[PDB]
Amino acid sequence: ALPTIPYHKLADLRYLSRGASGTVSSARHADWRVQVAVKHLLLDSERKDVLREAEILHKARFSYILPILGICNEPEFLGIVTEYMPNGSLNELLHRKTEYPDVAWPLRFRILHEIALGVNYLHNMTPPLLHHDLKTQNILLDNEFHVKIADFGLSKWRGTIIYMPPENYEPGQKSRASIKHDIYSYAVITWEVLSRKQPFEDVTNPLQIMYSVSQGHRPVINEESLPYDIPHRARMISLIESGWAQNPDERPSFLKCLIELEPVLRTFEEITFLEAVIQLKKTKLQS
Amino acid sequence: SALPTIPYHKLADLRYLSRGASGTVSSARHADWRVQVAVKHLDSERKDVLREAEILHKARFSYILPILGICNEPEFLGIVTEYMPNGSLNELLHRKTEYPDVAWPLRFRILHEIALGVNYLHNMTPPLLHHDLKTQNILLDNEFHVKIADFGLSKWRGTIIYMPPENYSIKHDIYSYAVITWEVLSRKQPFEDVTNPLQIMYSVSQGHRPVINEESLPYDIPHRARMISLIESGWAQNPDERPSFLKCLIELEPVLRTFEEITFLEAVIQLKKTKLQS
Ligand SMILES: O=C(N[C@H]1CC=C(c2cc3c(Nc4cc5ncsc5cc4F)ncnc3s2)CC1)C1CC1
Numbered sequence: 001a002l003p004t005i006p007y008h009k010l011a012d013l014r015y016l017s018r019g020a021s022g023t024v025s026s027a028r029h030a031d032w033r034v035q036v037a038v039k040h041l042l043l044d045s046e047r048k049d050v051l052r053e054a055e056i057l058h059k060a061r062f063s064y065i066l067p068i069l070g071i072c073n074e075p076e077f078l079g080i081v082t083e084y085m086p087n088g089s090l091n092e093l094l095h096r097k098t099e100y101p102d103v104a105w106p107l108r109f110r111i112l113h114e115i116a117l118g119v120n121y122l123h124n125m126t127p128p129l130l131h132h133d134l135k136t137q138n139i140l141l142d143n144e145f146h147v148k149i150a151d152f153g154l155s156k157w158r159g160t161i162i163y164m165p166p167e168n169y170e171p172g173q174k175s176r177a178s179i180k181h182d183i184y185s186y187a188v189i190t191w192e193v194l195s196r197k198q199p200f201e202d203v204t205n206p207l208q209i210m211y212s213v214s215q216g217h218r219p220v221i222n223e224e225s226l227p228y229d230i231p232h233r234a235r236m237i238s239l240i241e242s243g244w245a246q247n248p249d250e251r252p253s254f255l256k257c258l259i260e261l262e263p264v265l266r267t268f269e270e271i272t273f274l275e276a277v278i279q280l281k282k283t284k285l286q287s
Numbered sequence: 288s289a290l291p292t293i294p295y296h297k298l299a300d301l302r303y304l305s306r307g308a309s310g311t312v313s314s315a316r317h318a319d320w321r322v323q324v325a326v327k328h329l330d331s332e333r334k335d336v337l338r339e340a341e342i343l344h345k346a347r348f349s350y351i352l353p354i355l356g357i358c359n360e361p362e363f364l365g366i367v368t369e370y371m372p373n374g375s376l377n378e379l380l381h382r383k384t385e386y387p388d389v390a391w392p393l394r395f396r397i398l399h400e401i402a403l404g405v406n407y408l409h410n411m412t413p414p415l416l417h418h419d420l421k422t423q424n425i426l427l428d429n430e431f432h433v434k435i436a437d438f439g440l441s442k443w444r445g446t447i448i449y450m451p452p453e454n455y456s457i458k459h460d461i462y463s464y465a466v467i468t469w470e471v472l473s474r475k476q477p478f479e480d481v482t483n484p485l486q487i488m489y490s491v492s493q494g495h496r497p498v499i500n501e502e503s504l505p506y507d508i509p510h511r512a513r514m515i516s517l518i519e520s521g522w523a524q525n526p527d528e529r530p531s532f533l534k535c536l537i538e539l540e541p542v543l544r545t546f547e548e549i550t551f552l553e554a555v556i557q558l559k560k561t562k563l564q565s
């Protein structure tokens with residue numbers, strides 16, 4: 001049973017982000033004395049959707065899912081309270097390059113591994129949970145840069161488009177609950193992580209992107225996009241191309257991706273992951 | 288809402304980790320989720336395990352050992368939790384050849400996190416009382432963050448060294464925490480000079496406590512006077528003089544604010560490396 005958190009116990013409320021998913025602000029819990037974050041939106045249908053997401057996080061708890069701490073549900077305030085993620089989202093880590101000039105490969109591969117473990121867990125639930133809104137903005141990073149998947153506003157029990165498979169452009173119950181949506185998002189996320197590039201950066205119009213994706217086009221695979229020094233480069237390219245395959249049948253399960261990723265992740269010495277985080281903090285601090 | 292049920296056959300590569308009164312702990316790999324897990328496994332016995340699993344399910348929080356599911360089958364009963372790669376606080380404090388210098392910032396962060404954890408339990412509506420805190424039950428994750436474990440005798444409101452004398456209670460946990468704090472700052476066994484646990488109970492019953500002097504707590508300990516005050520109030524003979532965990536957090540917060548985030552990570556790497564070299 002999910003705790004209910006009185007709105008007045010959230011002190012020093014301060015805004016962080018606003019998106020389609022909702023508004024996110026930080027706070028400190030007056031009794032637990034920890035930093036928390038809270039996604040908040042009057043209405044009546046809107047309050048049901050917020051409650052819908054909160055129940056889903058409560059149920060989907062796992063080591064790589066954003067931990068829900070409670071719902072603030074009062075006439076003055078509706079909102080989901082979660083642990084506060086001090087290192088923001090994967091999107092700023094990838095694309096704020098003046099702030100993070102170097103993101104070592106061991107950390108990037110660990111992030112990819114942990115995303116896959118999170119989504120795999122969702123897909124292994126009774127009944128399977130489908131996220132359907134994976135994006136780098138929705139992968140949050142905790143104090144030591146471990147993954148927490150966020151934003152379940154579009155999850156379902158079994159530039160905003162760049163992660164969406166083409167068969168979902170015009171949604172029908174032929175894919176409405178397809179098990180192959182998330183892996184396609186993950187393939188694009190994987191390309192984004194290994195390249196530190198905006199997918200389809202060269203296309204000014206997002207409707208042009210959908211038309212091109214509908215025809216089978218994808219973010220470029222070459223040495224400029226995916227540099228030669230990517231560890232296990234050819235294996236990662238395979239993983240990307242099969243994950244975003246035009247034919248949904250032809251895309252793997254997250255289990256099979258994990259089976260392939262495990263020996264790759266074992267080639268990095270464990271301390272190397274911490275080395276990578278320390279390098280991020282030390283250079284950032286010096287700036 | 289509903290705690291998962293984990294079929295025993297999904298636990299691959301079971302291996303022994305430790306044995307205690309709480310039960311036997313084994314490590315494993317979950318076949319479908321592809322993560323390492325730990326499992327505490329054994330009719331009255333079946334009721335207690337389910338009670339503990341239910342309490343962990345309900346007491347979830349950032350410094351509480353995360354429960355992943357229950358194994359409840361005719362051949363196997365056991366609680367499945369995340370795997371803690373760095374063992375317990377007890378090993379970190381007392382394995383002095385393997386861990387020669389345990390950075391002060393990290394020890395204070397551990398104390399802060401235990402207090403945040405127990406503070407949460409006491410604020411739960413209704414409050415949860417742990418009643419078996421000990422350094423053996425403070426587990427350490429991959430970056431040495433605290434996860435409090437072993438809720439087998441927690442209650443809704445050497446195994447004796449953490450027990451207040453009136454127990455031979457709403458002030459139990461704070462007394463255990465005071466001894467834990469003394470242990471963390473001294474890296475000494477409480478009542479080190481004592482062959483028999485009945486000697487401890489007799490001396491604690493008389494108001495005696497682990498020694499506080501230059502040998503146990505050297506003068507160069509950071510914030511020595513503040514910590515000693517916190518310890519002595521926490522194990523006070525009269526339970527009414529023991530503070531709440533809120534007050535412990537009030538004492539610790541300004542101490543933890545003096546440390547840079549990089550120093551914690553350096554201390555963590557130093558500890559990770561020392562384990563591997565052993
Ligand atoms: O864009 C920038 N900064 C980002 C920096 C920090 C951000 C964070 C968001 C969240 C978060 N969101 C959240 C998701 C959620 N999903 C379901 S319920 C729920 C409740 C939540 F609060 N949850 C926990 N910690 C954090 S940190 C986004 C803005 C500029 C500065 C570079």
Ligand SMILES: O=C(N[C@H]1CC=C(c2cc3c(Nc4cc5ncsc5cc4F)ncnc3s2)CC1)C1CC1
Binds near residue numbers: 305339369371436
């Ligand atoms: O003792 C020795 N070494 C230790 C090194 C590593 C150990 C670990 C234990 C646990 C653990 N236990 C656990 C508690 C629990 N509480 C409620 S349910 C539940 C389920 C659990 F699995 N949980 C997760 N990770 C780990 S790592 C203990 C032995 C050497 C000296 C002889």
